Structures are given as C-alpha cells and as structure tokens.
Design a binder for this molecule. Structure first.
Ligand SMILES: CCOc1ccc(C(C)=O)cc1NC(=O)c1cc(NC(=O)c2ccc(CN3CCN(C)CC3)o2)cc(-c2ccn(C)n2)c1
Length: 116
C-alpha cells in the first residue's frame, strides 16, 4: 500500500532508461518501434503481438502510466523478451538485446533497493 507519485517514479527510473538510450551501438534497434515493412521483416507482428521499445516506455514514464516500479520493469523486459523471441540467437538484435539486459540490471538493481 506504498504509493509512488509519478514524479518520484520518473525521477528514480528515468536514469535507468537513459542508460539504455546511451548504449551504443546496442540500443540502436530499440530506440523506436519496430517498423516491419521498413526493416524488411514483414512477419514481425505475426510473432510479436505486444511490441515495446525505449520510446514507448519513455512516454509512459512521462505520462505517469506506471503506478509501481515493477510495472516499468515489466515493460523493459517485454522489450527484451520480444527481441529474444523474434530474433535468432546468432543475430545482431538478439546479441544487442543481451547486452542491453546486462546494462539494465546494473542500473535498475540499486534503484529498486532504494525505492521499495
Ligand atoms: C533489419 C532488421 O532490423 C531489426 C530487426 C528486429 C528488431 C527488433 C527490435 O526485434 C530491430 C531491428 N532493427 C535494427 O536492427 C536496427 C539497427 C540499427 N543500427 C545498428 O544496429 C548499427 C550498428 C552500427 C550502426 C551504424 N550506424 C550507426 C549510427 N549512424 C547514425 C548510422 C550508422 O548501426 C538501426 C536501426 C534504426 C531504425 C531507425 N533508426 C533511426 N535506426 C534498426
């Protein structure tokens, strides 16, 4: 029954999202929604039914869509899980995803401990 105001969540969590944006080159596939037609992967939405990317998560943070820290974390991991699902383990995007997940863990673990 602990209440998290949107400003407090945003202040605590936005640095962890910024760390993902900063990661170069590995965030490049993740900074915008997947465009299946433009990227040449027209079957994408046949596999990924709940797309998620950094810019969608940022907008939800900026508009107070997350009431709890774990709701933000779940969207970050939805982005990772989509990329590990759609892309082969031998592929650029799967490998970039794996790196982003390691970066996110380093950032989010201390923020969680201090948020409760
Ligand atoms: C083909 C299939 O793709 C995909 C399949 C599946 C997925 C998902 C999420 O399941 C995602 C994708 N997406 C990508 O793989 C992708 C990859 C890049 N760039 C790189 O990986 C990269 C490494 C080094 C350089 C050189 N770079 C640097 C910057 N410099 C201005 C230019 C040269 O680029 C970029 C983009 C992208 C989309 C919009 N934008 C503005 N950028 C998308």
């Amino acid at each position: 029954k602990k209440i998290f105001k949107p400003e407090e969540l945003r202040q605590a969590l936005m640095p962890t999202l910024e760390a993902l944006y900063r990661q170069d080159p590995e965030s490049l596939p993740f900074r915008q929604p997947v465009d299946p037609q433009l990227l040449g992967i027209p079957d994408y939405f046949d596999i990924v039914k709940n797309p998620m990317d950094l810019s969608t998560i940022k907008r939800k943070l900026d508009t107070g869509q997350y009431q709890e820290p774990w709701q933000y974390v779940d969207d970050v991991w939805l982005m990772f899980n989509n990329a590990w699902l759609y892309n082969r383990k031998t592929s650029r995007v799967y490998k970039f995803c794996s790196k982003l997940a390691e970066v996110f863990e380093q950032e989010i673990d201390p923020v969680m401990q201090s948020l409760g």
